[PDB]
Design an enzyme around this catalytic site. Sequence first.
Site, PDB file in Angstrom:
ATOM      1  N   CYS A  41      52.743  46.268 -38.209  1.00 29.13           N
ATOM      2  CA  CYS A  41      52.165  45.505 -37.122  1.00 29.13           C
ATOM      3  C   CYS A  41      51.151  46.295 -36.327  1.00 29.13           C
ATOM      4  O   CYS A  41      51.319  47.489 -36.127  1.00 29.13           O
ATOM      5  CB  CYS A  41      53.259  44.938 -36.233  1.00 29.13           C
ATOM      6  SG  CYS A  41      54.484  43.979 -37.141  1.00 29.13           S
ATOM      7  N   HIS A  98      54.563  41.944 -29.124  1.00 29.44           N
ATOM      8  CA  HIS A  98      55.975  42.025 -29.507  1.00 29.44           C
ATOM      9  C   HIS A  98      56.497  43.486 -29.570  1.00 29.44           C
ATOM     10  O   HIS A  98      57.696  43.681 -29.731  1.00 29.44           O
ATOM     11  CB  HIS A  98      56.289  41.223 -30.792  1.00 29.44           C
ATOM     12  CG  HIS A  98      55.858  41.876 -32.065  1.00 29.44           C
ATOM     13  ND1 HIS A  98      54.839  41.342 -32.836  1.00 29.44           N
ATOM     14  CD2 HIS A  98      56.397  42.928 -32.724  1.00 29.44           C
ATOM     15  CE1 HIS A  98      54.750  42.121 -33.901  1.00 29.44           C
ATOM     16  NE2 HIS A  98      55.680  43.075 -33.890  1.00 29.44           N
ATOM     17  N   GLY A 114      56.793  47.963 -39.506  1.00 36.25           N
ATOM     18  CA  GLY A 114      56.022  49.059 -38.929  1.00 36.25           C
ATOM     19  C   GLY A 114      54.519  48.886 -39.086  1.00 36.25           C
ATOM     20  O   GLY A 114      53.751  49.563 -38.398  1.00 36.25           O
TER      21      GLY A 114
HETATM   22  O1  OJ9 Z   1      57.620  40.377 -38.892  1.00 37.01           O
HETATM   23  C1  OJ9 Z   1      57.544  41.477 -38.356  1.00 37.01           C
HETATM   24  C2  OJ9 Z   1      58.105  41.732 -36.972  1.00 37.01           C
HETATM   25  C3  OJ9 Z   1      58.095  40.414 -36.233  1.00 37.01           C
HETATM   26  C4  OJ9 Z   1      56.968  40.032 -35.509  1.00 37.01           C
HETATM   27  C5  OJ9 Z   1      56.921  38.791 -34.909  1.00 37.01           C
HETATM   28 CL1  OJ9 Z   1      55.522  38.354 -33.969  1.00 37.01          CL
HETATM   29  C6  OJ9 Z   1      57.964  37.900 -35.020  1.00 37.01           C
HETATM   30  C7  OJ9 Z   1      59.097  38.278 -35.731  1.00 37.01           C
HETATM   31  C8  OJ9 Z   1      60.347  37.519 -36.077  1.00 37.01           C
HETATM   32  C9  OJ9 Z   1      61.189  38.585 -36.778  1.00 37.01           C
HETATM   33  O2  OJ9 Z   1      60.349  39.755 -36.992  1.00 37.01           O
HETATM   34  C10 OJ9 Z   1      59.170  39.527 -36.319  1.00 37.01           C
HETATM   35  N1  OJ9 Z   1      56.855  42.493 -38.879  1.00 37.01           N
HETATM   36  C11 OJ9 Z   1      56.513  42.791 -40.205  1.00 37.01           C
HETATM   37  C12 OJ9 Z   1      55.188  42.644 -40.592  1.00 37.01           C
HETATM   38  N2  OJ9 Z   1      54.743  42.602 -41.851  1.00 37.01           N
HETATM   39  C13 OJ9 Z   1      55.628  42.773 -42.813  1.00 37.01           C
HETATM   40  C14 OJ9 Z   1      57.012  42.948 -42.597  1.00 37.01           C
HETATM   41  C15 OJ9 Z   1      57.916  43.269 -43.640  1.00 37.01           C
HETATM   42  C16 OJ9 Z   1      59.221  43.550 -43.362  1.00 37.01           C
HETATM   43  C17 OJ9 Z   1      59.694  43.499 -42.063  1.00 37.01           C
HETATM   44  C18 OJ9 Z   1      58.860  43.184 -41.027  1.00 37.01           C
HETATM   45  C19 OJ9 Z   1      57.483  42.917 -41.253  1.00 37.01           C
END
Ligand code: OJ9
Lengths: 304, 304
Positions: free
Chosen positions: B145, B41, B143
């Site tokens: 990820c 992603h 961030g």
């Molecule tokens: O979720 C995500 C980014 C993301 C990845 C995927 Cl595969 C699908 C979607 C659908 C919307 O955002 C997506 N990353 C983050 C990881 N961990 C905590 C988070 C805390 C706050 C903000 C984002 C966070």
Amino acid sequence: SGFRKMAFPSGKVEGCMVQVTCGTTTLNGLWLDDVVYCPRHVICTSEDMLNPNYEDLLIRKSNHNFLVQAGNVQLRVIGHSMQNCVLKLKVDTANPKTPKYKFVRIQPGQTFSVLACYNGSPSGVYQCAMRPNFTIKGSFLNGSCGSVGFNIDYDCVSFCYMHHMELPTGVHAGTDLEGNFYGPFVDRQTAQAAGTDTTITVNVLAWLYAAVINGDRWFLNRFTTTLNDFNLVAMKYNYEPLTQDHVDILGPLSAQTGIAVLDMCASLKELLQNGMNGRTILGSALLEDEFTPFDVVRQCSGVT
Amino acid sequence: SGFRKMAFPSGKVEGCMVQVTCGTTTLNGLWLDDVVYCPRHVICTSEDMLNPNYEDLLIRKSNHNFLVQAGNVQLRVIGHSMQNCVLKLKVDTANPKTPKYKFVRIQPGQTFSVLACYNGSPSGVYQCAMRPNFTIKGSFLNGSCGSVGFNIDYDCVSFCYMHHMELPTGVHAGTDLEGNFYGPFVDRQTAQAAGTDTTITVNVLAWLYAAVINGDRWFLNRFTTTLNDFNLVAMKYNYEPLTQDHVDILGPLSAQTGIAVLDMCASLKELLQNGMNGRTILGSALLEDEFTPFDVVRQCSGVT
Ligand SMILES: O=C(Cc1cc(Cl)cc2ccoc12)Nc1cncc2ccccc12
Ligand SMILES: O=C(Cc1cc(Cl)cc2ccoc12)Nc1cncc2ccccc12
């Protein structure tokens, strides 16, 4: 989102761990520059620990009696000295992995990470706090002595603790890196009972803020209190008195959540009086006190 | 003595963390040998996440669009490929800090350490478990990820998780290092509700053994039970069924404490039925399930 008991990354500290052997005793040492720091009790036998005279025991040791091993390679000891309850072993080689570092003496309520080591090899990393009774609730076995506690600010490791001993109550005692014990503890096998392990109020409040930030808000109530009224309740529950300095330290968390510090105090007062009623906050059924306000902001902001 | 939520030392993994940027998105990558692994992603914008076609989005990217930075130095990308939900970026330089490693796919109930990272820089390390609903209760911000989960056996890092996303319930989902998600989750912004987060029974029992080893024995009772009787109680309390394999896995802990596994099951059954009554076990007011039998033995034996 999510809130975990998070330790600092331990790599910088792993690169400093060495094995120190004196006679039949083997423990851990911290190698920074050309000096290896270790608990002075490395020079003792089991019969010595009852009433050791460290100056006298040290007279019988020479540089060649301190075996220092970094990984599988031996370090040459070219000097040794006792500073309070630690030995400083001067080696002929500066640790090439020496990070930028400081030696700090922390106050009760402050948290740090511990890199538990055995035979100079790291076994694990966990977060703990200097308790108000100057003990730490660590996880240490025989051979863990010389394992260290630290904080990291970007690239600087501030070492604050070196493990020396376990008390009969299963709690731990140690020194700062100048060899001064935290609290009244001494490096001898004697009756040393720990004082009241009060709860670190400012840390509980910080963790309540962390819970609000992470969506756990059930404990928020319609009440407020004063510092004096809250402190009467805190006294009753063996919680540390909350000061205006603590209220000020909680300012950024109060600003982030829009919850006045005294309103959070009233929520905490109700949790103390009514209990949790089988509910949880951030996956805990008790009020967590080993996250400082700085730890909460750091974890909730992603400081690297 | 003492028992802590202990993570593996993170140094070996810190040496693998890099920053990966594609377009306007920056996340973490894992650099092993001449390959950088990261969530696929990284190629998406916010409008793409609703219904992304990763093969089509990837066609618009070339090697030069993936900016890989290790510390302050740029890595040259000489190839890129998608394997399931991860991208494998072939770089021209092998990571000199590559530890001995394996890619493993863990089962629910298994624990691992997470090195939370932002912009390729480590922020902290914590221990968690693959929940029976295939989520993890981590601590991750935007961030994070590409941050990874791992176990260490002496000198070999077994990577088991890479962080991809947070669900609306604040729980986390990700993949193994072959890019296959744990559980039914997909890398898209859609309705993905987690299933029942049952309690990992074998881990609770292991932690009860850890409590006995550390002196917390108040919960030990005069009762025994059978696997079938215990499982009726476990069903009622949303605990995972205990099998003979789990009983066998608890053998070393049973041998160490002299407490038969089924007797510990009866103690656990009473704790489920009667509660804790305001008491604690290993500093917890709830039954901890993120320590495996192997973790307990390891922590209680000092494996480095
Ligand atoms: O979720 C995500 C980014 C993301 C990845 C995927 Cl595969 C699908 C979607 C659908 C919307 O955002 C997506 N990353 C983050 C990881 N961990 C905590 C988070 C805390 C706050 C903000 C984002 C966070
Ligand atoms: O306590 C010691 C060694 C020690 C040091 C000092 Cl300064 C005084 C005395 C009096 C007796 O032993 C002493 N080390 C250990 C550290 N942490 C945990 C322990 C778990 C089991 C066994 C020993 C543990």
